[PDB]
Design a binder for this molecule. Structure first.
Ligand SMILES: Nc1nc2c(ncn2[C@@H]2O[C@H](COP(=O)(O)OP(=O)(O)O[C@H]3O[C@H](CO)[C@@H](O)[C@H](O)[C@@H]3O)[C@@H](O)[C@H]2O)c(=O)[nH]1
Ligand SMILES: Nc1nc2c(ncn2[C@@H]2O[C@H](COP(=O)(O)OP(=O)(O)O)[C@@H](O)[C@H]2O)c(=O)[nH]1
Ligand SMILES: [Cl-]
Ligand SMILES: [Cl-]
Ligand SMILES: [Mg+2]
Ligand SMILES: [Mg+2]
Lengths: 318, 317
C-alpha cells in the first residue's frame, strides 16, 4: 500500500477541479453505474429543498444522480413535505426496517437507507448545508469513477486562514485517530457527512447509530478495503451550522465510544472497566456532564445506548 | 468512599461563599499550615502584577498565602522583572532541577516548582488571568483547610446559562473521563489551572510535562488518595482565552496521550500499535494534523514528546 499517512495524503487527495461533471457523467455512462444520493434529514425544512433543487440543476448539465432519497427523522418542521414537494423520494427513518423499532439517530437512518437505495454507488450528503454548491454532490464521485483502486471517497473542505475541521473533528476525532488509527490521520474532514462508496461495501459493514456513525464507518472501511483504496476530495468552502458546545460534548462522547468499542474487539483494549471500580460508577450509556450555571453547579445526565446495526446484507431480503 | 459521581458531586462541591477568608486564615493558623502559591509564567508581564497585588491585599485582610512563586519560562516581555518588582519570588524553570535539562513546557515548570515550595499546601494558579478576584486565590483552600479528609481541590467556574468548560475540556477531557475514569466526571473544570493539594501529595505522583499535566494530576491524585479526598469549589465567573482551534488540537492530543499512557500502565490498554501496522505509521510524538486552506489541502505535522517526571520524592529529600 502506502508507507505512511504522508504517502497516502500524497497519492489520494484530489481537487473537485479535476473532475468536471460532464466527464463524470460520460464516465458514469460508460461504466453503466447508477448513483443513489442519500440525505439523512432531521428538521432541515429550510435547506433540503435547495439541495434537491441544485442536484436537479446539475443532473440537467450532467446526469450523475439517479435517485435522491431523503430519509426523514419525522421532523416536526415539515422537512418530509418539503423534500417531497421538491421531487425527492422521501422515507421515514422509523418506517424503514420497521422490525428494528424507532430510529436511534443519524447512523440508524443512514443504515436503513440501504434498504431502498437502488444505486450501484451510494452517496451520503448532509441535508442541512445552507449554500449548497453543485460540487458538494459530484466532487467525491471523481476518484470512485476514475481512479482504479479507489472504493471509498470522503469529502474535504473549509469553513468560509486554515481549517482543520469543526470542534469535534479537531478536539476528538483527530487526536483519537492519530493515537489509535494513525492511518486515518491524513483525512481533512474524517467526520464529513458527504462520502461515497459502492452499495455492496456499505451493505457489508455494521453501522453505529447516533453521531458515532462516521467514526465507525471510517474505521470499518479502513479495515475492510485498506488505506490505499480510500481517497478524499477538496470541495472548497462549506458553511456548517454551529452547534452548542454543550451538545457537542455528547457527540464527542459518541466518537470516543465508537473508538473504544472497536479497540475492544481488536483486543487492544480489554477490561474497559477498571477493577476495584464499584459497578455503580460504571454505565457507558450514562453520560455525566458537570456544568456551572448562574444559580450554582449542576450535574447533567444524558442517557444514550450505543446501538449498533449488523451489516444490512445479513438482515435484509436478498 | 462515595458510590457514584452523583453522590460525590453533592458531598464535595462547594461555593467559595461558604469559606470566608478570615475563617480560613483562623483554621490555617490553628493547624500551623503554610501555603505556597505557584504561578507558572510565560509572557504574562501584563497580568502577573495584578495577581500578585491581589494576593498581597487579600493577605492584609486574611493571612492565607505564605509564599508567591513566579516560575518563569524566561519570558522576553519582562515577566520576571514585574513579578520581582511586585514582591513575588521569581525562578527560572530552566534553573530548577537543572540536572533534567531545560524545561518541557508548563508541567515541567509546575513539577520543578515543588523543589522551591516551602508550604505544607501548594496552590497552583494561572498567571494570565485578566481580572483576578480574591476568591481565585482563597476559594479552593476552603475544603483542604476545613474538611479534614479532603486533600485536593479543583476550581470550578463559568465564562461571562450553562457552561461545561472550554473546548478541550468539553470535547476531550470529559468524554474521556466519562468512559475511562467515570469517578472524575463530576468535575466542572477538570483541566482548571487553579487547584491545591498538600505538598506531600504532589511530591508523591509523577508529573506529565506540557499540556497534559492537569489531566495526569487528576488521574494520579484519583488513584493515590481516592475520589472522596477530592473536591471542587465554585469561584464564580472567570473570563477565558480564545486560543485558536488549530492549536487546541495539539493540546487535545496531549490529553489523549496522557490517558492512553495511564491505560497502558493499568493493563487496560495493550499492543497500542495495531498488530500489522508498519512502523512508518507509528510515532506517538508525531501528530499529523490535516487541514484545508485556500491554496489546497496541507498535512501539518507537529512534534511533542510526552515526558513524565517521576515523583519528586524519588529524586529529593
Ligand atoms: N434522519 C435523521 N437525520 C439526522 C439525525 N440527526 C442528524 N441528522 C441529519 O444529518 C445531518 C448532519 O448531522 P449534524 O447533526 O448536522 O452533524 P454536524 O453537527 O454537522 O457534525 C458533523 O460531524 C458528525 C460526526 O459524525 C457527522 O455525523 C455529521 O454528518 C456532521 O458532519 C443533517 O442533515 C441532519 O439533519 C437523525 O437523528 N435522523
Ligand atoms: N513557566 C511556564 N509557564 C507556562 C508555559 N506554558 C504556559 N504557561 C503558563 O501557564 C498558564 C496557562 O497557560 P496555558 O496552557 O496557555 O493556558 P490554557 O490555554 O488556558 O490552558 C499561563 O499562566 C501561562 O503563562 C511554560 O512552557 N512554562
Ligand atoms: Cl461498547
Ligand atoms: Cl450502551
Ligand atoms: Mg451540520
Ligand atoms: Mg457513565
Amino acid at each position: 500500500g502506502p508507507a505512511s499517512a504522508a504517502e497516502w495524503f500524497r497519492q489520494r487527495s484530489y481537487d473537485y477541479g479535476q473532475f468536471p461533471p460532464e466527464d463524470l457523467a460520460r464516465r458514469k455512462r460508460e461504466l453503466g453505474l447508477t448513483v443513489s444520493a442519500v440525505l439523512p434529514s432531521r428538521n432541515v425544512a429550510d435547506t433540503v429543498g435547495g439541495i434537491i433543487d441544485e442536484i436537479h440543476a446539475l443532473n440537467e448539465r450532467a446526469p450523475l444522480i439517479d435517485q435522491i432519497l431523503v430519509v426523514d427523522a419525522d421532523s416536526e418542521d415539515g422537512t418530509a413535505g418539503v423534500a417531497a414537494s421538491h421531487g425527492a423520494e422521501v422515507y421515514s427513518e422509523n418506517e424503514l426496517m420497521s422490525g428494528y423499532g424507532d430510529a436511534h439517530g443519524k447512523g440508524d437512518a443512514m443504515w436503513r437507507a440501504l434498504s431502498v437505495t437502488r444505486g450501484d454507488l451510494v452517496l451520503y450528503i448532509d441535508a442541512d448545508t445552507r449554500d449548497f454548491r453543485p460540487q458538494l454532490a459530484y466532487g467525491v464521485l471523481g476518484p470512485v469513477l476514475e481512479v482504479p483502486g479507489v472504493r471509498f471517497v470522503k469529502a474535504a473542505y473549509r469553513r468560509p486562514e486554515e481549517d482543520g475541521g469543526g470542534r469535534v473533528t479537531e478536539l476528538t476525532a483527530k487526536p483519537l485517530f492519530n493515537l489509535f488509527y494513525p492511518e486515518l490521520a491524513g483525512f481533512v474532514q474524517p467526520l464529513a457527512g458527504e462520502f461515497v462508496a459502492d452499495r455492496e461495501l456499505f451493505c457489508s459493514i455494521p453501522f453505529l447509530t447516533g453521531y458515532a456513525v462516521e467514526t465507525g464507518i471510517m474505521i470499518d472501511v479502513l479495515k475492510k478495503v485498506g488505506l490505499g483504496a480510500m481517497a478524499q476530495v477538496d470541495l472548497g468552502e462549506r458553511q456548517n451550522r454551529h452547534q452548542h458546545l454543550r451538545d457537542l460534548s455528547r457527540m464527542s462522547y459518541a466518537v470516543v465510544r465508537a473508538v473504544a468499542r472497536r479497540l475492544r474487539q481488536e483486543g487492544r483494549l480489554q477490561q474497559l472497566r477498571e477493577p476495584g471500580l464499584p459497578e455503580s460508577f460504571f454505565q457507558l450509556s450514562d453520560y455525566l456532564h458537570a456544568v456551572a450555571t448562574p444559580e450554582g453547579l449542576k450535574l447533567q445526565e444524558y442517557v444514550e445506548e450505543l446501538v449498533e446495526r449488523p451489516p444490512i446484507n445479513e438482515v435484509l431480503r436478498v
